Amino acid sequence: DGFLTEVGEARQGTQQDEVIIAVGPAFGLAQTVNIVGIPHKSILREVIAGIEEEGIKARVIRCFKSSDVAFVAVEGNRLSGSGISIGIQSKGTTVIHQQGLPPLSNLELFPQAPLLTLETYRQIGKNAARYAKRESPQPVPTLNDQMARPKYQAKSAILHIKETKYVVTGKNPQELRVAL
Amino acid sequence: GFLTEVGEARQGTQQDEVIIAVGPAFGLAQTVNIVGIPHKSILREVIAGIEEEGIKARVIRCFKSSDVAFVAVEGNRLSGSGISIGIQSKGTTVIHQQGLPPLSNLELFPQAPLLTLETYRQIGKNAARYAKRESPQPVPTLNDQMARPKYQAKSAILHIKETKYVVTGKNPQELRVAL
Amino acid sequence: MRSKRFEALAKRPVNQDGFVKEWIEEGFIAMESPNDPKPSIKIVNGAVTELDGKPVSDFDLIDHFIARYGINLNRAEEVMAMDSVKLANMLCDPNVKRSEIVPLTTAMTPAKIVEVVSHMNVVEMMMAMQKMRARRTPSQQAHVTNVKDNPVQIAADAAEGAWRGFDEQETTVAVARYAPFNAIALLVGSQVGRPGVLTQCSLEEATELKLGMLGHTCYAETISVYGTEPVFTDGDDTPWSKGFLASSYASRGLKMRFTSGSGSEVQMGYAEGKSMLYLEARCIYITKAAGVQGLQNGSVSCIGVPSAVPSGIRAVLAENLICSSLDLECASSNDQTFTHSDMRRTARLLMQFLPGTDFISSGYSAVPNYDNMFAGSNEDAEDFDDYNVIQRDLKVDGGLRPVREEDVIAIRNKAARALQAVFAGMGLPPITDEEVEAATYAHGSKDMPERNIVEDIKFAQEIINKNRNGLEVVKALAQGGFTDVAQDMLNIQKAKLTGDYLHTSAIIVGDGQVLSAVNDVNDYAGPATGYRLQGERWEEIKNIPGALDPNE
Amino acid sequence: MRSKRFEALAKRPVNQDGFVKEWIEEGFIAMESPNDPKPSIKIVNGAVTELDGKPVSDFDLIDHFIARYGINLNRAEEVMAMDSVKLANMLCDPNVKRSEIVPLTTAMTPAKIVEVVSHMNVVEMMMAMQKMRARRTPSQQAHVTNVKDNPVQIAADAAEGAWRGFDEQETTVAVARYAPFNAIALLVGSQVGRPGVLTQCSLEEATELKLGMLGHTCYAETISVYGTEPVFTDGDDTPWSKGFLASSYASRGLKMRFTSGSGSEVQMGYAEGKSMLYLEARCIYITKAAGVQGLQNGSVSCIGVPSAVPSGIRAVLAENLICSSLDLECASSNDQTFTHSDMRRTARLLMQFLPGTDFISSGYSAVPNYDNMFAGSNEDAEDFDDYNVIQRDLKVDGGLRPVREEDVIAIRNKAARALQAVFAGMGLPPITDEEVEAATYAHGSKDMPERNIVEDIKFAQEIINKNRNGLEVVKALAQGGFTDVAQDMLNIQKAKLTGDYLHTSAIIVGDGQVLSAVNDVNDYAGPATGYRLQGERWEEIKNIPGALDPN
Amino acid sequence: SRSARVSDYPLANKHPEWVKTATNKTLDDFTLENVLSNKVTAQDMRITPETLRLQASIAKDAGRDRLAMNFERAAELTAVPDDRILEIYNALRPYRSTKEELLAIADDLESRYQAKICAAFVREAATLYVERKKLKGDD
Amino acid sequence: RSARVSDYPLANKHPEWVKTATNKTLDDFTLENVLSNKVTAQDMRITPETLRLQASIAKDAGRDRLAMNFERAAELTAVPDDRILEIYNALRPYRSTKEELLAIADDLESRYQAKICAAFVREAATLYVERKKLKGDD
């Protein structure tokens, strides 16, 4: 069942060496796999592993104020001890954000969820950790498929409409405990 | 110049023959068909297919029209067997028979670009067999949906050029085939 | 050092197409040629003394025919004096009724009407077409053939075509002696798909009339006419022989239309230095003059000619518009291959598809193109899904509909079995149960077992030579376990007795109900008027394969 | 068993596309929805009290903005009373001047004009579009990007694009930090292809304005607006912030248009149960209300939404028509992939291509689609020959032309060398001769040597953070052997001082000549009137490769 | 004869009784039963000149004069046998006949079939075929 | 006196009507002056005069809303780039308190004489309260 447990309102990091992974309001709940069937449990596992293999701590939170991946990520970079966060929607869309950047700007973006693999997710974790250590890592190789929208846009819209139902205005993020 | 006129073509003197009637530019202003196959080679194969069947081949050139059907008709009315083969410089071929409407026929090959020397020989064979009052399996149908897209304009041009050699009221001339 | 960008472009299919620069001297120019005659007309004692700059003393058979029967002389001088630009404006103006235009367009000389439509761009032409189209409801015609002239396959494919929505279906032959079999197989299969679908078998003229007299066809379309006298001559006819042929068909109660198409005169060697559109205009007037109700045009079989030159596809739409503007049913081609490119063939199709014509395509291929005996159509069996999708995308009635595999399988199977009973009843070379199954699930002749062709054509010719008529087909069906199909066959034959479907744009729908320009008048008057896709027909078009419920 | 006929159809590319049945509650319906608001408007004391059935007490920011600035209230009641069918008839009637229609449309409410165009079929819509189009002369816009954000490739591809006929070119980024490099590369290459071509770099709003302030772009297009408040909010703006942003660009002498497009609200989760066309109409009115001169619409990036439902492609044409009918420049999409089928994407393109719009395509991909950073365009580099062929077939001016390989190679090479001189002169990571050569003969990034991305973005960012403006680019060119390109760059920069190209549909053609709806008025009055393909332009279009002289 | 307007169309729906066959059969006479027993044969299933002339009147009322003309000609040809139809058609094709053969055909059509319109049509062709050289021996 | 469509394009019919923020002319901008820094980016900035001439032209062309936009732009020419970005961002969702927005309005008005823009911003402030787009409303 649920591999994510709420441990209370997410608050400002107590140490600098951490990266916050902010997930959408339906992640691991009403939705458990991304747009191409990859389990959320596996995705989180890989992102965390990527961050930790870089000697950085991973801290997961859930955002409710918006289902937009940029704002989910901003919610997190605002509390991250390193200023760095990774936003992830249930459908899979991911972004590496940094406190101080405009909400719709970012460090790295993955605009085509259908193309991401568990390997990409791990690499996203590693790069985020490296940004946390103030390094300048080679950005994750750009993936682009002209038929991605033709084949998945409608499904993406539907999946988003569904996660958006879980948006709760004014509700601050909740830190989550990840079960093995 | 492998084709020499030997006088006006006339009614056959024997039943066992098939007339091959060619356009007014065949072997002259034009020497290859639409896809480059030599007229000399084509005529050679058609004749060979006919002779293989123990039938004689007689070649004539038509001037009253460049239309393959009418070129073929000038032939079937003179053919001792009533059977003729019509061929335009661009390669279009038809096996005709005296008595049939001009635009009808026994067998037709409407896409010259698809014909090979083997088809031409097969056409000669079938014509001879018709001459022998037999009912041969028609030459397998060749059809390519892109033949027109690729060759229709060219076909028109080649036909426009052969058509300049048409001469109103000029009867067919029998031809001697070289080599 | 080659540019990889151009090496990529060089491999594009469109670059395999045939293109040529304009060659006026030989008629290789689609339209707007400086060689074409200036419009004009002089009338003395109610007879034409001059037609488009040519004195009656120089008239060829075509000028004579058109001058004496093809122009509405009462108003010829009046419309000749009208500004061609204003005339072209009237054609596309949604507020100038079709009924107000026809009297004037039919009074124009061929050069005059060509001048008029030449002032228009394709959008304006389409805008005008939707108004000038004779029948209010647009329709569709398909080709049903195969490289083997296999009768079982024809019957099955004809049933599917009819089921998908075609109201007219046409076949032809690889081996001419096969005709009777192709025609009968087409008719039987069509009536099984949808009773009322009209069928034809395109052959040499005398051969086709004879096949029609025997009752194995419902109508004739490829009754050719040409733009120049020499070409008409090689076509083995004159305006008078074709005029006589037209009335012969009607005298037997058979619907018929003529066929023409831009580029034929160039393809046949004598364009007399005129543009394709001008020569096609003469063909359209020959058709009007003959008293023929409709015309199949839009380059048709010679599409490779106008498409090779500039504004060729535009000229094609123009000739279609001239046809309808002259109050003639228009079977607008879109039935012949001219390109290796899907983008290009789609643009050519939409010219008629968008506005709608009496028959959007006069030969959509209901079989894969390798089996198309007309050397390939602009669309074929593999495009059915794309066609339905575009109908749905643009809310345009293209005359066809999505269908279920199970229904098609059942209809194809019944058509093959019905023909099997016909062959058994008429004592023709048997159609085995294996052939019935093959035809049921086939895509093309590659899935059909080989037949004894020599034996088939032997009996096929006995049908002609012994005058075995259509009633023998009815009896075979009736006595072979197909009383229903037999009755539908007899009903289609009875249509030849009333003369109703002889009228402009006539087809037969529903329960043997004729639908022509007489009782289905086009009344376009701009937005929200005239034919509009809606109701059940719209629902039917929306329901395409893969349209899944998002809600879940 | 299975029918082989159906197995053949099942393999067809179109069957890989996404289709869905209408779902009104979530906005999954293109147009003509029974749940859309009935048109209406009530005015009291000069202020709107009701807009399309909604009382002013329930107005959201979009309603307020439109009600207060997007409708001519002096005639709104008059026009509301007019029969919609008659109005639709007037739109396509070739004899009802454009000048007679604009006064009526600009007085209609969003629901009103939607009800009007919804009575039309696509042929009538195209007939009307050729008349309502603001600029007499149609144009084209292209995408110039690649998956590596390779600046050298962008320069070369941009030069080729300009040479082929595009009057506007746009780039974007895989890695946002690369922006400055992409823009400069696009600008330089474009001016080398044809001086006067306008360039843009689509990014997050504040980032793009800043980049524009530094002088590395000529205009901005993706200045987004949305049809519902929640979506607009997730878009990080309001009608007022975007209105302010519009004037900010003008205050800097930069041309700009907004961007919208049917389906965005659905894609972003809040369609508030309205049809795509209705919501897009609100976007069009926000654009008008803001005083923005043009709009890029026709679904654009969310084309996969309307295309999935019935009449979606027709609705796309309809929204383009509404735009032009409201007297707004219209960059009519045809810039995003939605289908696997060539037949289907062609039918979608012809809706705007046939009648002609200010920009038939607001993003024809001038690079193979695998390199298209907007996730693929409705047309790409490999379609160039087909495009020129269709122009020739239908005698339609599609804004592009055939080109010689030798000219393109030379133009691409010069653009690459010019950019090489810019980088050397500005102290940016070097562009090697091997790279210049690769960009010259390349088709896409697959033919380009890998660059040090970390290095490039480091310097790209110093351009922004150290405020290195466009004059440095001019200087680099002028001192690196490209005095001519430098002069052209300076001339394009000088265009931001006059304000002339800030007008409706403005582009810059020939020798620095501005061509807009102001001095190139569309005067359509039916056949033989308005813009007509002919003369040297017709000859240029006729001359396609492969057309041999039949002798 | 009896006229007809567009309101009388389609005859099958408005006036099915107006339709008779050359052998005076009615549409209802044509049933599977009668066909199978040969009570009715191909000979009975032939449109009449009355029907074609009614359609001609309708074509005329629909504003289609030439179409009406065509139907009038067809009305006359109903009386001519199939074989004779084919012979006359072929006689009109290029280079098939002499002027006299055509004139003879015209006289036959007129005196034996009362096909005066078709007769005039053929005599018109004869004259023009001489001028445009389409008679036998002109190729 | 005021520009009409007949005066458009200004660059062609009245190049002299165009001056820059530093009172430079179109001809002053040459490669020579750029290379020697005789003219700098500071010199290349459209003036409120030019924008108002265009606003007049737009109006004469029947596009009032476009003219208003140009009128606002004219006022904004006096506001520094960094401040433009500041005000734009302040108007975006959840960025400001009503007080801060009004503070921006007053500044626009008193420091830049941008009354149109100031009123625009005050209007936003009122509506943002009602539609809850002020800081803390998300």
Ligand code: B12
């Ligand atoms: C469709 C599309 C849009 C649509 C849909 C976005 C949505 N939120 O629903 C619209 C028009 C609204 C849009 C807007 C913007 N976009 Co956008 N968009 C695209 C596009 C062409 C295709 C993506 C796609 O269909 N993927 C396939 C589906 C199946 O996968 P998916 O994972 O579900 O896709 C989602 C993400 O791509 C996401 N998304 C789209 N744009 C952006 C931008 C940011 C910053 C983020 C975090 C997410 C995001 O929306 C998709 C649907 O939910 C991409 C191009 C590309 N290379 O992918 C650009 C692209 C991703 N967008 C971009 C930008 C800059 C923007 C804007 C900031 C522009 C503006 N004027 O403000 C806004 C951001 C809006 C927001 N709050 O999310 C840039 C990103 C540059 C970068 N490296 O950071 C790209 C690469 C190119 C471009 N300029 O269009 N976009």
Ligand code: B12
């Ligand atoms: C284009 C075409 C036409 C055009 C061009 C013909 C010309 N003479 O220039 C037009 C419309 C004029 C035409 C007319 C007719 N055609 Co045709 N035509 C075709 C088509 C669709 C394509 C051929 C092609 O483009 N090939 C590619 C080019 C590159 O090759 P090509 O060798 O140069 O092609 C030439 C021959 O095909 C020839 N040709 C075309 N039709 C006919 C008919 C006969 C009897 C003969 C001898 C030659 C011939 O003309 C082509 C151009 O020069 C074929 C279908 C098919 N399966 O091929 C039918 C086809 C060959 N035609 C057919 C028929 C019956 C006719 C007509 C008799 C019909 C009528 N109403 O009278 C007339 C005959 C005209 C004449 N005097 O030759 C049948 C033949 C049946 C048979 N087995 O005998 C076919 C198979 C199908 C059909 N019904 O359209 N045709």
Ligand SMILES: [Ca+2]
């Ligand atoms: Ca046909």
Ligand SMILES: [Ca+2]
């Ligand atoms: Ca764009």
